[PDB]
C-alpha cells in the first residue's frame, strides 16, 4: 500500500543517482 505507492519515489531517486554518475 503506502510502500507500494511510495515506490515510485525511491525508484526515481535511484534512477537519477545512477544516471547522474
UniProtKB/Swiss-Prot annotation:
- Tell me which species this is from: Pelophylax lessonae
What tissue expression does the UniProt record report for this protein?
Expressed by the skin glands.
Subcellular location(s): the record lists: Secreted
What this chain does, per the record? Shows antibacterial activity against representative Gram-negative and Gram-positive bacterial species, and hemolytic activity.
Identify the stretch annotated as signal peptide in this record.
Answer: none
Span of the entire protein shown here: 1 to 21 of 46
Q: Can you say what this protein is called? A: Esculentin-1A
Please give the family membership noted in the entry.
Answer: Belongs to the frog skin active peptide (FSAP) family. Brevinin subfamily.
